[PDB]
Structures are given as structure tokens and as C-alpha cells.
């Protein structure tokens, strides 16, 4: 319940959403009684590139705020050499918390959903970034709207931690566009599913071997979306160049037709 400053506006404490390595994300309270997320990322023990990995994806967002609804607002931020303050949209609950609480989502609510993961995802495409680690943690509710919460260029956990669940079998190699393509080909299977495609595999080694199986035959049940079934097939090939382009999902008959 402290208070805190960002450039002269009061911000009251309310709770704690999540928190990060020399970061927490907060539910603020400003003067006129509004609403609002602040990130506080503590700088102290922090290098120089880490420091400009940070300052990269606040101009991005910052720039990105423009070009589409699909990334999260970000109102003000003050910047130190001790700390950086981000007064961000707080948004109803991420994908992850919703997609855990809720045992079936409304196949409908998956269309929408995915809509504004393609746009989103797109946006960043459309200015040389790619993620590289999509995860529903990393996508906002904002008032049945998703939103984009960050780029994956700075180097979390609400108080998916190093994930391989979604990753691209050229990450386990190892990144283009397409890798951003096996990552939400994962989270849309997730919610087709109930789970993601290589998520029954116990043990990290065997699954890592798995994704990166050729001859490991990838499940995909007869449900009544057909297209769904299609868009599935398409994001979750293991050659980036045999899958999908994000463009080409847009004008797929499942985001399309009514
Ligand atoms: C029942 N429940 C609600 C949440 C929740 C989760 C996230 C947010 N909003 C934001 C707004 C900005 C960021 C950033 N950066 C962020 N990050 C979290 C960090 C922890 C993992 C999920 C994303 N979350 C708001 C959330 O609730 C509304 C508020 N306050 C999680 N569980």
C-alpha cells in the first residue's frame, strides 16, 4: 500500500500482479482514482547491455503504440540510472492465468483471440522483431481484446519460466519470423486441445528430442473447425520454410469466414 512517483504523478500500491529478476509488476491507483499497471525494473546490478536491451524495447513500445490496438498502452515512464517506472494498461488477466483458470474456452472466443495474437505478432513482424519465445504469459485480456505485453528483447512470473513447450525446433537447433509462427501454433493448439502438442512428454531431454523429431508424428484430432485443424497443421511444421507466414494466416478461411 506505499505510494510511488512517475514524472510528478502520485501512484498508490493496491497489489502485486508479477515479478522479474530486478523487476515487479504492480496494481497502481493514480490521483483522478484511475487504474493503471506499473512495471519497476531495478537497474542497480544491472550491465550495459542489459541496460540497453531494456531501453530498446521501451522505445519500441513506445514507437508501437501507433501502429496497433493489439500492444499494450504505455502512458508515461520515468527513467534513472537507479530505475525505470512504466505506467502501462492493467487489462482484466494474461492469457496464461485465463487459459489455466478456465477448463474449455468457447470456440468463438478462440477465433477472436487469435485474431489479435496474428495482428499483434504481426505489428512487431512489420518493424524487424521477432519474439522468438511466445507464451500466453506474454499476451494481455484487455476488455475481450488480447494485447502484446512485450517483444522479447530484453532479457515472467506471476507473483512460464523458461518454457520449451512452445519453442521452435530451430530454437533447439540453435530465429525468423516463422519461429513466432511455432510459438502461437502451440498456444492455439493449447486452446484447441487442452494442451500443448508435446506437453504429455514428462521428461525436458525427451521432449526436446521430440520437437525436433521429424518421425515424431504430431497428434491433430478430428474437431468440427476444420480450418482450425488446417492452421494448426500449417504452424506446427518443423521446416520454418514449410510453415506458414504470418500474411498468409491472416487470409486463412478460419480468421475470415463468419
Ligand atoms: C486473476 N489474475 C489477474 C491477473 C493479471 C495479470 C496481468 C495484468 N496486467 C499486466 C499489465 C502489464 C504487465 C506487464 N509488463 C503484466 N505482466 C504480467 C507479469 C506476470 C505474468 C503475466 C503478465 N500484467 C493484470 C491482471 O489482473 C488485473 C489487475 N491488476 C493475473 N491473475
Given at each position: 500500500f506505499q505510494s510511488m512517483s512517475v514524472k510528478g504523478r502520485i501512484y498508490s500500491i493496491l497489489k502485486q500482479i508479477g515479478s522479474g529478476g530486478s523487476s515487479k509488476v504492480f496494481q497502481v491507483l493514480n490521483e483522478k482514482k484511475q487504474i493503471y499497471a506499473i512495471k519497476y525494473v531495478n537497474?542497480?546490478?544491472?550491465?550495459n547491455q542489459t541496460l540497453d536491451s531494456y531501453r530498446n524495447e521501451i522505445a519500441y513500445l513506445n514507437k508501437l503504440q501507433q501502429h496497433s490496438d493489439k500492444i499494450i498502452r504505455l502512458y508515461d515512464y520515468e527513467i534513472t540510472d537507479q530505475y525505470i517506472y512504466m505506467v502501462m494498461e492493467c487489462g482484466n488477466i494474461d492469457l496464461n492465468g485465463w487459459l489455466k483458470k478456465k477448463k474449455s474456452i468457447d470456440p468463438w472466443e478462440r477465433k477472436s483471440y487469435w485474431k489479435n495474437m496474428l495482428e499483434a505478432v504481426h505489428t512487431i513482424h512489420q518493424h524487424?522483431?521477432?519474439?522468438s519465445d511466445l507464451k500466453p504469459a506474454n499476451f494481455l485480456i484487455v476488455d475481450g481484446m488480447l494485447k502484446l505485453i512485450?517483444?522479447?528483447?530484453a532479457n515472467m512470473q506471476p507473483d512460464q519460466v523458461?518454457?520449451?513447450?512452445?519453442?521452435?525446433p530451430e530454437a533447439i537447433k540453435d530465429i525468423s519470423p516463422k519461429s513466432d509462427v511455432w510459438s502461437l501454433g502451440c498456444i492455439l493448439y493449447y486452446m484447441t486441445?487442452?494442451?500443448?502438442?508435446?506437453?504429455?512428454?514428462?521428461?525436458q531431454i525427451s521432449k526436446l528430442h521430440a520437437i525436433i523429431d521429424p518421425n515424431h508424428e504430431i497428434e491433430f484430432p478430428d474437431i468440427p473447425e476444420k480450418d482450425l485443424q488446417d492452421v494448426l497443421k500449417c504452424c506446427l511444421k518443423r521446416d520454418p520454410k514449410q510453415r506458414i507466414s504470418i500474411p498468409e494466416l491472416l487470409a486463412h478461411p478460419y480468421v475470415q469466414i463468419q
Open positions: 537497474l542497480e546490478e544491472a550491465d524487424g522483431i521477432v519474439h512485450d517483444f522479447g528483447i523458461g518454457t520449451v513447450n512452445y519453442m521452435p486441445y487442452g494442451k500443448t502438442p508435446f506437453q504429455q512428454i514428462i521428461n
